[PDB]
Amino acid sequence: GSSGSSGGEIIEGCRLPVLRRNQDNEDEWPLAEILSVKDISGRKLFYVHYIDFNRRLDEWVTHERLDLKKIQFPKKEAKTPSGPSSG
Numbered sequence: 484g485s486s487g488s489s490g491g492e493i494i495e496g497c498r499l500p501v502l503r504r505n506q507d508n509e510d511e512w513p514l515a516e517i518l519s520v521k522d523i524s525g526r527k528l529f530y531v532h533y534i535d536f537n538r539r540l541d542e543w544v545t546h547e548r549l550d551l552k553k554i555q556f557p558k559k560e561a562k563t564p565s566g567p568s569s570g
Contacts, residue, residue, distance in 0.1 A: 490551030493520055493529060498555040501531045502548035512550065 500512035515531035518541065522528070529549060532541040 490554055493517055493527070493546075493549060493551070494556070495519060496557035496559075498534075498557075499531075500550045500553050501533070501544045502550075503533065512553075515544070 495517050497517040498514060499517075501515035503511045503513055505511050514534045516534060518530040518532055520527060520529050521543075527546055528543045529545070530541060531544050531549075532539075
């Protein structure tokens with residue numbers, strides 16, 4: 484089963500621009516991929532990893548930075564129906 488939804492639930496793999504103020508201090512929006520989620524009293528935490536010229540960073544972020552409006556969920560398994568028989 485599956486239906487259309489807007490940023491239903493932030494799962495691991497989701498790719499979205501996680502705000503990040505560089506040195507210059509310019510609200511950036513680099514591509515980041517979800518690694519793990521969390522929750523500390525409503526404060527959901529997500530370990531995103533910037534993907535753009537870099538060795539390795541990986542850092543926890545917040546939803547405010549999570550631009551689901553620019554999310555790019557992963558394409559796990561081919562997306563296709565299949566006449567369900569017997570149910």
